[PDB]
Structures are given as C-alpha cells and as structure tokens.
C-alpha cells in the first residue's frame, strides 16, 4: 500500500540529526573522558523530496502512531528498544520459519545457475553414448 500525504502542509526538506555507532575517531576522541559531551555527538544532513520520500515519510510517521501507541499500551517495558530487532526476527521467520519448498512462492531459493549446471552436463552422458 502506497502513502498518501493528507497533512495540511509538508516541509519537503528534512534537515536531520543523528549519531554514528562508529566514526573513525581522531586520536583519543573515542575515549569518554576526552570525547565530546552529550551535546556534541550529533551529525547533521539535509535530504530533499526526491521520489516524494520526505512528504511520504511525514505521512508514514503520522499513520504509524496508532499501532505504535497501542503496542506501547500493551507492553510492561518502561522503555522499548526492541521493535526493530523483533521485526528483523519476524523477517527471517516469515521466509525461513518453515520448510522451504523450492520453486514455491514463499521459498527464497533460486536454483537458476544450477538448473543450468545439470541440463548443461547432461551432455556428458547423452553426449557420450558411444561404444
């Protein structure tokens, strides 16, 4: 299902801030004692509305709220950090949680290059049928 932005306005540019789980630290800057304070750990960027992704993202966050709020109502965790990890697990369970029937629609196994490994090397037996 596609995203239809139905907001009164859309800021088509996303001036964003975020962190970095890595970042080749300069010298001692990775050491907490020497590194930046809480205010200085952020990187910034600017993203424009190519393919309408920014205005679609604003609508997506809007529409996500009901399901997210209902999830938070039902959990007893005070702070929830596991949403994305659980969706990664559900990704794998959906594709690999049962028996993978090759050539079936729910099995992500491609026997392409090795359909062409048997049917090519049948011409080693029907090829050499000589005596």
């Amino acid at each position: 299902e596609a995203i239809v932005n139905a907001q009164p306005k859309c800021n088509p540019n996303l001036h964003y801030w975020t962190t970095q789980d890595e970042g080749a630290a300069i010298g001692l800057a990775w050491i907490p004692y020497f590194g930046p304070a809480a205010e200085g750990i952020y990187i910034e960027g600017l993203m424009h509305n190519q393919d309408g992704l920014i205005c679609g993202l604003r609508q997506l966050a809007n529409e996500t709220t009901q399901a997210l709020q209902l999830f938070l109502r039902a959990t007893t965790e005070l702070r929830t950090f596991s949403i994305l990890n659980r969706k990664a697990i559900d990704f794998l369970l959906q594709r690999w949680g049962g028996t993978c029937h090759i050539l079936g629609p729910d099995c992500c196994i491609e026997p392409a290059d090795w359909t062409k490994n048997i049917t090519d090397k049948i011409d080693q037996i029907i090829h050499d049928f000589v005596d």
Partner: protein, 253 residues
C-alpha cells in the same frame, strides 16, 4: 501491527516484514531505522497558546517511552515549569538518561501555574513528546521537547543557534489560560497566538533599545494593539513604534 516504510517503484510504501517478496533483501540490522518527525513539518500552529492546547492532564495511564535513532531540526521546542497554586510540581522530573531535544531554533520556556487535574500530561492528538532520541507519551518537567511522531524504515542495501523565549502563564491547561512574554523580570507583553518567534525577539530588542522597560519596582505589562502585523510556514517564507502607559498596564502602537 506496527507498519514499516519501504522504497518500491521510486516511492515510499507502507508494508511489513511478512509482506515482502523474495527480491526484497534485508542483509543487516543497519537497514532498519527509526525516525522522529516533528508536527511542525505538517503545518500545525507552533505558537505557545496553540501548542499548549494540544496537551492535557490525565490519571490512570502509565507513561511509556520508545527510542528513535534520528530526528529533525526543530524550529519550535517547549520547556515547561508548571506548578499548582499550592506550589507543588505539576510535572515529574526527567527520568535518568532522558535529555532535551537536541536541535531547537527557539525554545519556548513556559513557567507558571494551573490546576493540573491529572498525574501526567499527555498529547491530546496521540502524538509523542520527542526528547533526545527517546519519545515519551508524557511531558517531563523543565525538559525541552518537540511534538512529533515516529516512523520505522527498511533502507535499501545501497551552525547551530538556539534562543530561549520565556513566558509566564496562569490557568495552564484550562480554556482560560493567560500568557505573558517575558522581556525582563518586571517587563512583560500580553501574548497572542499571532506573535511569531522573530516578532517576539524584535519586540524584545525594540523594548530594550527604546528604553521601554520598567524603571520601577513594579510589574509593567505592555499590550500590542490589533493594529500591528506579525504573520505561512517557517520553511517557505520593526524600527520605531509608540509606547504610552495606561500591576501597571500599557499599550504599544
């Protein structure tokens, strides 16, 4: 089910992990991301009178917090120090590890009083109060936040200035709320919804440089008369006035 954003046919689609096809490839948890988007970017009114009417107090509902990894630079953030008339705090202290929203052009710091008929202050439209990479359902005392919402995404494989604007408030949370913009500890301006942040800052500079502050031990409250203009979204967009005095009220034209 919590929806997931994914890029398909040069467009963002709402999908889920159980609805992807085999060509869709998720080879790393690095492809999964959470973003906080500010209500600002949807065109909501950001003035203090309009913004505070979106929040209300409620008991019986435990607060909930969810993390988000990336956010949007905010033009307007808010920081509340509200007490009851008896002096008790209306809002709880920020829990350990919850810091203010990191990018705010204008921080509207509102101090004042109200009934606060509820244990926690929630967003009446179901949005979140965004802090430093943590989104909460409730407002924490003296902690800068932006109103916003959270989205979850599957990505494909392949200067900072901040100004604090201070307000005094009475009857906070009710439909009879009065707001004053603070010039100094004794000079104030009656706040109206139409006043933009830059108008308040230039009205503040004009009052200082025209010498229109209180030169008394008492409190001086200016009123900007309907004559003068102030206001359009922030991303797509005062020299000399008259001041005469009329708890000392006054008018500016």
């Amino acid at each position: 089910s919590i929806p997931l954003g994914v890029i398909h046919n040069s467009a963002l689609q709402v999908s889920d992990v159980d609805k992807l096809v085999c060509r869709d490839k998720l080879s790393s948890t690095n492809q999964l991301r959470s973003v906080g988007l500010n209500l600002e970017g949807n065109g909501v009114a950001t003035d203090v009178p309009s913004a505070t009417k979106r929040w209300g107090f409620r008991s019986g509902v435990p607060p909930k917090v969810v993390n988000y990894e990336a956010g949007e630079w905010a033009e307007n953030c808010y920081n509340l120090e509200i007490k009851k008339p008896d002096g008790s705090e209306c809002l709880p202290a920020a829990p350990d590890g919850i810091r203010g929203f990191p990018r705010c052009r204008y921080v509207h710091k509102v101090s004042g009083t109200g009934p606060c008929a509820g244990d926690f202050a929630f967003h009446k439209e179901g949005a979140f109060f965004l802090y430093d990479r943590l989104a909460s359902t409730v407002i924490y005392r003296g902690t800068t936040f932006a109103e916003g919402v959270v989205a979850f995404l599957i990505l494909p494989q392949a200067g900072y200035y901040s100004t604090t604007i201070r307000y005094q408030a009475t009857g906070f949370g009710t439909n009879e709320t009065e707001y004053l913009f603070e010039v100094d500890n004794l000079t104030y301006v009656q706040l109206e919804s139409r006043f933009t942040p830059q108008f308040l800052l230039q009205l503040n500079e004009t009052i200082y440089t025209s010498g229109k502050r209180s030169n008394t031990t008492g409190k001086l409250i200016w009123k900007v008369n309907p004559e003068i203009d102030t206001t359009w979204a922030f991303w797509e967009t005062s020299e000399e006035l008259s001041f005469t005095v009329v708890x000392x009220x006054x008018x500016x034209x």
